[PDB]
C-alpha cells in the first residue's frame, strides 16, 4: 500500500517506509486501532469532531 | 456568507470571532486551546493591539447564553513574506492569553499534516466555510453564524473560468461563478474546513475575492497546506514580548 493512493488505507495520516511497508498514524487525542488504519478518540474533545452530532 | 444557511448552534465549534474595541473585525479557527488561525490582512489597521479579543462558543451576537468564552490575544504572528495591503501569504497565528476550556460548544479543528493535506484533502471536492460576515454584497452582516458548502477548483480551472490579483501557489479558489454563493467581507479569517473519514480538517482561510458572489468570479482562500510546518514550529516556540511578531517564511 502507498500513501498517495487511497491515503494508504489510513483513516488519518500515512507514512511510506523502506520496502512494501506502510505505517498509519493519528492526530494527537487519537490512538490507532489494531487494524493498523483506524483512529479512535482518547480525549473528551478530540479535534475535528462535533460533540452534539457525535451524541446525535 | 452569501447564499448559505444558519449553522446550527454547536455545529461549527472551532469558529472564532475577533473583536476590536467590541466591534466585529474578522473570523478565525481554533486549532488548540491557545492557538487560533486567521488572515494576516485583518490586522493591517490595528492601532492598539490591547483592544483585540477572541470569542469562542459564539453563535448569536444579540444575546449572551453563557457558552461564549472571551480571551485577550497575546501574540499575532504573521509570515515575513506578507505585505500589508496585498493578498499573498494571507495567514496569521494568534496566541491567546489564557487557554479556552473545551466544551460541547468549543472544540479545535484538526490542523492536518502537509502530505495528507496535499495528497488527500486537496481532492475532497466540497468543504464548509463559515462566518458572521455580510449576507449580501453591500449588505448587512449576520447576527447568527452562517455556513456554506463550496466546491474547490484547481487553479488552472479557476483562471479558465474567471471572467486583478494573481492566484498564487499560496491560494486556492472555491465556490460558484453564477453570483449565488460565496464568503464575503466580515468572513475573512474564518475556516474553510474539509471532512475526511469522520473528521474535519483546516484546509483554507477566507481571504479575498472580487466583491462577493460576483458573476464570473470565485472566492479565494489561503492554502493552509503551505503553512503547516511554519505553524507547527511556531506552536513549539516560546512567546516573545510585543503583540505583533513577524516570523520568517518559509
Ligand atoms: Ca451570543
mmCIF file of C-alpha atoms and ligand atoms in Angstrom:
data_model
loop_
_atom_site.group_PDB
_atom_site.id
_atom_site.type_symbol
_atom_site.label_atom_id
_atom_site.label_comp_id
_atom_site.label_asym_id
_atom_site.label_seq_id
_atom_site.Cartn_x
_atom_site.Cartn_y
_atom_site.Cartn_z
ATOM 1 C CA UNK A 1 0.000 0.000 0.000
ATOM 2 C CA UNK A 2 1.216 3.535 -0.822
ATOM 3 C CA UNK A 3 0.063 6.760 0.812
ATOM 4 C CA UNK A 4 -0.709 8.694 -2.404
ATOM 5 C CA UNK A 5 -3.369 6.130 -3.406
ATOM 6 C CA UNK A 6 -6.466 5.921 -1.185
ATOM 7 C CA UNK A 7 -4.408 7.520 1.654
ATOM 8 C CA UNK A 8 -2.665 4.145 2.028
ATOM 9 C CA UNK A 9 -5.970 2.928 3.519
ATOM 10 C CA UNK A 10 -5.323 5.063 6.623
ATOM 11 C CA UNK A 11 -8.135 6.953 8.349
ATOM 12 C CA UNK A 12 -5.758 9.889 9.054
ATOM 13 C CA UNK A 13 -2.007 10.179 8.374
ATOM 14 C CA UNK A 14 0.149 7.775 6.359
ATOM 15 C CA UNK A 15 3.926 7.196 6.194
ATOM 16 C CA UNK A 16 5.699 5.217 3.453
ATOM 17 C CA UNK A 17 8.650 3.125 4.688
ATOM 18 C CA UNK A 18 11.593 1.314 3.079
ATOM 19 C CA UNK A 19 10.165 -1.734 1.296
ATOM 20 C CA UNK A 20 6.492 -2.593 0.866
ATOM 21 C CA UNK A 21 5.930 -1.087 4.347
ATOM 22 C CA UNK A 22 3.286 1.438 5.406
ATOM 23 C CA UNK A 23 2.507 2.913 8.824
ATOM 24 C CA UNK A 24 -0.673 4.848 9.603
ATOM 25 C CA UNK A 25 -0.634 7.459 12.333
ATOM 26 C CA UNK A 26 -3.212 9.590 14.139
ATOM 27 C CA UNK A 27 -3.546 13.185 15.318
ATOM 28 C CA UNK A 28 -2.972 13.988 18.986
ATOM 29 C CA UNK A 29 -6.021 12.968 21.002
ATOM 30 C CA UNK A 30 -6.459 9.770 18.949
ATOM 31 C CA UNK A 31 -4.961 6.258 19.076
ATOM 32 C CA UNK A 32 -4.507 3.735 16.269
ATOM 33 C CA UNK A 33 -6.522 0.527 16.420
ATOM 34 C CA UNK A 34 -5.051 -2.954 15.894
ATOM 35 C CA UNK A 35 -6.299 -2.951 12.284
ATOM 36 C CA UNK A 36 -3.437 -0.529 11.701
ATOM 37 C CA UNK A 37 -5.649 2.007 9.896
ATOM 38 C CA UNK A 38 -8.482 3.255 12.181
ATOM 39 C CA UNK A 39 -8.203 6.057 14.773
ATOM 40 C CA UNK A 40 -10.316 6.321 17.945
ATOM 41 C CA UNK A 41 -10.514 9.346 20.309
ATOM 42 C CA UNK A 42 -8.577 9.205 23.585
ATOM 43 C CA UNK A 43 -9.887 12.525 24.976
ATOM 44 C CA UNK A 44 -13.332 14.034 25.604
ATOM 45 C CA UNK A 45 -12.993 16.711 22.913
ATOM 46 C CA UNK A 46 -10.738 15.482 20.104
ATOM 47 C CA UNK A 47 -10.087 17.873 17.215
ATOM 48 C CA UNK A 48 -12.399 17.850 14.212
ATOM 49 C CA UNK A 49 -15.379 16.141 15.810
ATOM 50 C CA UNK A 50 -18.675 17.852 16.622
ATOM 51 C CA UNK A 51 -19.849 16.776 20.097
ATOM 52 C CA UNK A 52 -23.580 17.476 19.622
ATOM 53 C CA UNK A 53 -23.559 15.333 16.441
ATOM 54 C CA UNK A 54 -21.413 12.552 17.947
ATOM 55 C CA UNK A 55 -24.001 12.342 20.766
ATOM 56 C CA UNK A 56 -26.694 12.667 18.000
ATOM 57 C CA UNK B 1 -21.670 34.473 3.863
ATOM 58 C CA UNK B 2 -23.906 34.827 0.772
ATOM 59 C CA UNK B 3 -26.439 32.072 -0.048
ATOM 60 C CA UNK B 4 -25.638 29.869 2.962
ATOM 61 C CA UNK B 5 -27.678 28.847 5.987
ATOM 62 C CA UNK B 6 -27.556 29.375 9.735
ATOM 63 C CA UNK B 7 -25.021 26.984 11.231
ATOM 64 C CA UNK B 8 -26.947 25.194 13.979
ATOM 65 C CA UNK B 9 -25.556 26.218 17.373
ATOM 66 C CA UNK B 10 -22.608 23.973 18.286
ATOM 67 C CA UNK B 11 -22.047 22.573 14.776
ATOM 68 C CA UNK B 12 -19.163 24.957 14.000
ATOM 69 C CA UNK B 13 -17.419 24.734 17.450
ATOM 70 C CA UNK B 14 -13.969 25.809 16.142
ATOM 71 C CA UNK B 15 -15.280 29.117 14.747
ATOM 72 C CA UNK B 16 -13.696 32.217 16.321
ATOM 73 C CA UNK B 17 -14.988 35.807 16.301
ATOM 74 C CA UNK B 18 -12.366 38.523 16.529
ATOM 75 C CA UNK B 19 -13.354 41.884 18.026
ATOM 76 C CA UNK B 20 -11.519 45.182 18.297
ATOM 77 C CA UNK B 21 -12.963 47.694 20.767
ATOM 78 C CA UNK B 22 -16.044 45.441 20.840
ATOM 79 C CA UNK B 23 -16.649 45.701 17.090
ATOM 80 C CA UNK B 24 -16.598 42.760 14.706
ATOM 81 C CA UNK B 25 -13.261 42.508 12.906
ATOM 82 C CA UNK B 26 -12.798 39.071 11.362
ATOM 83 C CA UNK B 27 -13.203 35.342 11.849
ATOM 84 C CA UNK B 28 -10.726 32.677 12.897
ATOM 85 C CA UNK B 29 -10.265 28.977 13.614
ATOM 86 C CA UNK B 30 -9.341 27.351 16.935
ATOM 87 C CA UNK B 31 -6.679 24.646 16.365
ATOM 88 C CA UNK B 32 -5.672 24.080 20.007
ATOM 89 C CA UNK B 33 -6.685 25.549 23.375
ATOM 90 C CA UNK B 34 -4.401 28.618 22.988
ATOM 91 C CA UNK B 35 -3.918 28.864 19.205
ATOM 92 C CA UNK B 36 -6.175 30.478 16.556
ATOM 93 C CA UNK B 37 -5.528 30.756 12.813
ATOM 94 C CA UNK B 38 -6.829 33.813 10.986
ATOM 95 C CA UNK B 39 -5.935 36.053 7.996
ATOM 96 C CA UNK B 40 -2.992 38.451 8.098
ATOM 97 C CA UNK B 41 -4.972 41.236 6.306
ATOM 98 C CA UNK B 42 -7.382 41.519 9.258
ATOM 99 C CA UNK B 43 -4.580 43.194 11.235
ATOM 100 C CA UNK B 44 -3.440 45.838 8.693
ATOM 101 C CA UNK B 45 -5.205 48.716 10.502
ATOM 102 C CA UNK B 46 -4.886 47.810 14.206
ATOM 103 C CA UNK B 47 -3.556 50.785 16.188
ATOM 104 C CA UNK B 48 -3.619 49.334 19.727
ATOM 105 C CA UNK B 49 -3.198 45.543 19.962
ATOM 106 C CA UNK B 50 -4.551 45.530 23.565
ATOM 107 C CA UNK B 51 -8.085 46.050 22.239
ATOM 108 C CA UNK B 52 -8.123 42.697 20.317
ATOM 109 C CA UNK B 53 -10.378 39.971 21.762
ATOM 110 C CA UNK B 54 -11.162 36.427 20.527
ATOM 111 C CA UNK B 55 -14.549 34.859 21.249
ATOM 112 C CA UNK B 56 -15.137 31.083 21.184
ATOM 113 C CA UNK B 57 -18.501 29.347 21.574
ATOM 114 C CA UNK B 58 -20.312 32.243 19.896
ATOM 115 C CA UNK B 59 -23.433 31.786 17.827
ATOM 116 C CA UNK B 60 -25.939 34.680 18.090
ATOM 117 C CA UNK B 61 -24.435 38.148 18.516
ATOM 118 C CA UNK B 62 -27.628 39.654 20.004
ATOM 119 C CA UNK B 63 -27.668 37.549 23.176
ATOM 120 C CA UNK B 64 -25.360 36.120 25.795
ATOM 121 C CA UNK B 65 -26.204 32.483 26.512
ATOM 122 C CA UNK B 66 -23.177 31.533 28.648
ATOM 123 C CA UNK B 67 -21.366 29.276 26.159
ATOM 124 C CA UNK B 68 -19.222 32.185 24.943
ATOM 125 C CA UNK B 69 -15.606 32.403 26.124
ATOM 126 C CA UNK B 70 -13.595 35.584 25.526
ATOM 127 C CA UNK B 71 -9.787 35.797 25.569
ATOM 128 C CA UNK B 72 -7.275 38.581 25.082
ATOM 129 C CA UNK B 73 -4.946 37.953 22.137
ATOM 130 C CA UNK B 74 -1.341 37.854 23.433
ATOM 131 C CA UNK B 75 0.541 37.497 20.103
ATOM 132 C CA UNK B 76 -0.307 37.964 16.419
ATOM 133 C CA UNK B 77 2.268 36.150 14.248
ATOM 134 C CA UNK B 78 2.468 36.950 10.520
ATOM 135 C CA UNK B 79 4.790 35.498 7.861
ATOM 136 C CA UNK B 80 7.703 37.711 6.793
ATOM 137 C CA UNK B 81 6.515 37.373 3.195
ATOM 138 C CA UNK B 82 3.133 39.012 3.832
ATOM 139 C CA UNK B 83 2.904 42.619 2.616
ATOM 140 C CA UNK B 84 0.204 44.841 4.145
ATOM 141 C CA UNK B 85 -2.437 45.882 1.597
ATOM 142 C CA UNK B 86 -1.878 42.837 -0.646
ATOM 143 C CA UNK B 87 -3.292 39.306 -0.925
ATOM 144 C CA UNK B 88 -0.422 36.801 -0.915
ATOM 145 C CA UNK B 89 0.548 34.911 2.280
ATOM 146 C CA UNK B 90 -2.706 35.851 3.985
ATOM 147 C CA UNK B 91 -2.372 33.963 7.245
ATOM 148 C CA UNK B 92 -1.885 34.820 10.934
ATOM 149 C CA UNK B 93 -1.349 32.668 14.004
ATOM 150 C CA UNK B 94 -2.749 34.089 17.233
ATOM 151 C CA UNK B 95 -1.803 33.032 20.757
ATOM 152 C CA UNK B 96 -4.475 33.519 23.368
ATOM 153 C CA UNK B 97 -3.510 34.994 26.729
ATOM 154 C CA UNK B 98 -5.193 32.076 28.544
ATOM 155 C CA UNK B 99 -6.476 28.767 27.180
ATOM 156 C CA UNK B 100 -10.091 28.329 26.262
ATOM 157 C CA UNK B 101 -11.897 25.466 28.018
ATOM 158 C CA UNK B 102 -13.039 22.758 25.616
ATOM 159 C CA UNK B 103 -16.789 22.111 25.871
ATOM 160 C CA UNK B 104 -19.568 20.848 23.584
ATOM 161 C CA UNK B 105 -19.526 24.337 22.025
ATOM 162 C CA UNK B 106 -15.751 24.906 21.849
ATOM 163 C CA UNK B 107 -13.569 22.336 20.071
ATOM 164 C CA UNK B 108 -10.469 22.787 17.905
ATOM 165 C CA UNK B 109 -10.365 21.897 14.222
ATOM 166 C CA UNK B 110 -7.581 19.495 13.222
ATOM 167 C CA UNK B 111 -4.547 21.088 11.584
ATOM 168 C CA UNK B 112 -3.569 18.318 9.178
ATOM 169 C CA UNK B 113 -0.121 17.067 8.186
ATOM 170 C CA UNK B 114 1.160 18.618 4.947
ATOM 171 C CA UNK B 115 1.335 15.386 2.920
ATOM 172 C CA UNK B 116 -2.154 14.268 3.985
ATOM 173 C CA UNK B 117 -3.497 17.720 3.132
ATOM 174 C CA UNK B 118 -1.824 17.878 -0.272
ATOM 175 C CA UNK B 119 -2.373 14.247 -1.323
ATOM 176 C CA UNK B 120 -5.839 13.607 0.098
ATOM 177 C CA UNK B 121 -7.670 16.663 1.461
ATOM 178 C CA UNK B 122 -6.877 18.760 -1.647
ATOM 179 C CA UNK B 123 -9.048 16.348 -3.702
ATOM 180 C CA UNK B 124 -12.115 16.377 -1.479
ATOM 181 C CA UNK B 125 -14.480 18.426 -3.645
ATOM 182 C CA UNK B 126 -16.764 20.153 -1.121
ATOM 183 C CA UNK B 127 -15.803 21.925 2.112
ATOM 184 C CA UNK B 128 -17.582 24.270 4.545
ATOM 185 C CA UNK B 129 -16.917 27.998 5.016
ATOM 186 C CA UNK B 130 -18.445 29.996 7.870
ATOM 187 C CA UNK B 131 -18.758 33.429 9.456
ATOM 188 C CA UNK B 132 -20.804 36.411 10.618
ATOM 189 C CA UNK B 133 -19.917 38.434 7.506
ATOM 190 C CA UNK B 134 -22.170 40.241 5.019
ATOM 191 C CA UNK B 135 -25.195 38.286 3.869
ATOM 192 C CA UNK B 136 -25.098 40.200 0.539
ATOM 193 C CA UNK B 137 -22.607 42.308 -1.378
ATOM 194 C CA UNK B 138 -23.095 45.842 0.033
ATOM 195 C CA UNK B 139 -25.339 44.314 2.697
ATOM 196 C CA UNK B 140 -25.659 43.950 6.469
ATOM 197 C CA UNK B 141 -23.711 41.330 8.411
ATOM 198 C CA UNK B 142 -25.211 38.254 10.067
ATOM 199 C CA UNK B 143 -26.418 38.101 13.680
ATOM 200 C CA UNK B 144 -26.268 34.269 13.656
ATOM 201 C CA UNK B 145 -23.293 32.249 12.418
ATOM 202 C CA UNK B 146 -23.707 31.231 8.791
ATOM 203 C CA UNK B 147 -22.291 28.299 6.884
ATOM 204 C CA UNK B 148 -21.873 27.437 3.163
ATOM 205 C CA UNK B 149 -20.773 24.319 1.247
ATOM 206 C CA UNK B 150 -18.378 25.258 -1.610
ATOM 207 C CA UNK B 151 -16.530 23.188 -4.252
ATOM 208 C CA UNK B 152 -12.774 23.627 -4.718
ATOM 209 C CA UNK B 153 -11.225 24.248 -8.139
ATOM 210 C CA UNK B 154 -7.763 23.509 -9.475
ATOM 211 C CA UNK B 155 -6.102 26.878 -10.112
ATOM 212 C CA UNK B 156 -5.864 26.267 -13.886
ATOM 213 C CA UNK B 157 -9.641 25.745 -13.980
ATOM 214 C CA UNK B 158 -10.236 28.827 -11.770
ATOM 215 C CA UNK B 159 -8.321 31.016 -14.235
ATOM 216 C CA UNK B 160 -10.045 29.470 -17.304
ATOM 217 C CA UNK B 161 -13.485 30.081 -15.736
ATOM 218 C CA UNK B 162 -12.912 33.549 -14.221
ATOM 219 C CA UNK B 163 -14.438 36.224 -16.493
ATOM 220 C CA UNK B 164 -6.964 41.594 -10.928
ATOM 221 C CA UNK B 165 -4.643 39.850 -8.426
ATOM 222 C CA UNK B 166 -2.951 36.552 -9.446
ATOM 223 C CA UNK B 167 -3.956 33.212 -7.900
ATOM 224 C CA UNK B 168 -0.634 32.089 -6.345
ATOM 225 C CA UNK B 169 0.521 28.703 -5.049
ATOM 226 C CA UNK B 170 -0.373 30.038 -1.562
ATOM 227 C CA UNK B 171 -4.054 30.300 -2.554
ATOM 228 C CA UNK B 172 -6.914 28.240 -3.968
ATOM 229 C CA UNK B 173 -10.301 29.060 -5.489
ATOM 230 C CA UNK B 174 -13.602 27.746 -4.248
ATOM 231 C CA UNK B 175 -17.298 28.491 -4.752
ATOM 232 C CA UNK B 176 -19.561 29.322 -7.703
ATOM 233 C CA UNK B 177 -19.276 31.713 -10.647
ATOM 234 C CA UNK B 178 -23.071 32.334 -11.056
ATOM 235 C CA UNK B 179 -23.369 35.052 -8.386
ATOM 236 C CA UNK B 180 -25.360 32.996 -5.872
ATOM 237 C CA UNK B 181 -22.967 31.728 -3.172
ATOM 238 C CA UNK B 182 -19.694 32.964 -1.639
ATOM 239 C CA UNK B 183 -17.960 34.088 1.522
ATOM 240 C CA UNK B 184 -17.844 37.879 1.959
ATOM 241 C CA UNK B 185 -16.397 40.825 3.840
ATOM 242 C CA UNK B 186 -16.510 40.122 7.537
ATOM 243 C CA UNK B 187 -15.916 36.393 6.972
ATOM 244 C CA UNK B 188 -12.169 36.969 6.390
ATOM 245 C CA UNK B 189 -10.012 34.766 8.614
ATOM 246 C CA UNK B 190 -12.666 32.126 9.084
ATOM 247 C CA UNK B 191 -12.306 28.398 8.347
ATOM 248 C CA UNK B 192 -12.574 26.500 5.123
ATOM 249 C CA UNK B 193 -12.953 23.033 6.680
ATOM 250 C CA UNK B 194 -12.849 19.683 4.905
ATOM 251 C CA UNK B 195 -14.381 16.408 6.098
ATOM 252 C CA UNK B 196 -12.478 13.157 5.562
ATOM 253 C CA UNK B 197 -13.426 9.783 7.030
ATOM 254 C CA UNK B 198 -15.314 11.148 10.035
ATOM 255 C CA UNK B 199 -13.052 14.096 10.965
ATOM 256 C CA UNK B 200 -12.866 17.769 9.882
ATOM 257 C CA UNK B 201 -9.570 19.457 8.955
ATOM 258 C CA UNK B 202 -8.384 23.033 8.277
ATOM 259 C CA UNK B 203 -7.666 23.413 4.553
ATOM 260 C CA UNK B 204 -8.219 27.123 3.945
ATOM 261 C CA UNK B 205 -8.736 30.607 5.336
ATOM 262 C CA UNK B 206 -11.310 33.091 3.964
ATOM 263 C CA UNK B 207 -9.038 35.627 2.256
ATOM 264 C CA UNK B 208 -10.284 37.617 -0.741
ATOM 265 C CA UNK B 209 -12.365 37.923 -3.889
ATOM 266 C CA UNK B 210 -13.974 40.316 -6.372
ATOM 267 C CA UNK B 211 -16.800 41.877 -4.390
ATOM 268 C CA UNK B 212 -18.910 38.992 -3.050
ATOM 269 C CA UNK B 213 -20.869 36.499 -5.143
ATOM 270 C CA UNK B 214 -19.798 38.454 -8.281
ATOM 271 C CA UNK B 215 -20.735 36.703 -11.518
ATOM 272 C CA UNK B 216 -17.702 35.180 -13.248
ATOM 273 C CA UNK B 217 -15.624 35.039 -10.060
ATOM 274 C CA UNK B 218 -14.859 32.616 -7.243
ATOM 275 C CA UNK B 219 -13.828 33.121 -3.607
ATOM 276 C CA UNK B 220 -10.092 32.909 -2.919
ATOM 277 C CA UNK B 221 -8.712 31.128 0.157
ATOM 278 C CA UNK B 222 -5.270 30.840 1.742
ATOM 279 C CA UNK B 223 -3.822 27.397 1.004
ATOM 280 C CA UNK B 224 -3.110 26.302 4.568
ATOM 281 C CA UNK B 225 -1.111 23.238 3.464
ATOM 282 C CA UNK B 226 1.768 25.573 2.503
ATOM 283 C CA UNK B 227 1.957 26.779 6.132
ATOM 284 C CA UNK B 228 1.657 23.619 8.242
ATOM 285 C CA UNK B 229 5.399 23.356 9.045
ATOM 286 C CA UNK B 230 5.608 27.115 9.695
ATOM 287 C CA UNK B 231 2.639 26.900 12.090
ATOM 288 C CA UNK B 232 3.851 23.769 13.870
ATOM 289 C CA UNK B 233 7.273 25.311 14.547
ATOM 290 C CA UNK B 234 5.711 28.483 15.974
ATOM 291 C CA UNK B 235 3.415 26.486 18.251
ATOM 292 C CA UNK B 236 6.550 24.741 19.675
ATOM 293 C CA UNK B 237 8.302 28.089 20.371
ATOM 294 C CA UNK B 238 8.401 30.297 23.471
ATOM 295 C CA UNK B 239 6.367 33.538 23.418
ATOM 296 C CA UNK B 240 8.224 36.824 22.650
ATOM 297 C CA UNK B 241 7.439 40.249 24.114
ATOM 298 C CA UNK B 242 5.314 42.598 21.958
ATOM 299 C CA UNK B 243 1.978 41.515 20.460
ATOM 300 C CA UNK B 244 2.976 41.572 16.767
ATOM 301 C CA UNK B 245 5.643 39.122 15.581
ATOM 302 C CA UNK B 246 6.885 38.771 12.013
ATOM 303 C CA UNK B 247 8.276 35.285 11.579
ATOM 304 C CA UNK B 248 10.434 34.098 8.696
ATOM 305 C CA UNK B 249 8.645 32.184 5.948
ATOM 306 C CA UNK B 250 9.431 29.537 4.945
HETATM 307 CA CA1 LIG C 1 -24.108 35.111 21.924
#
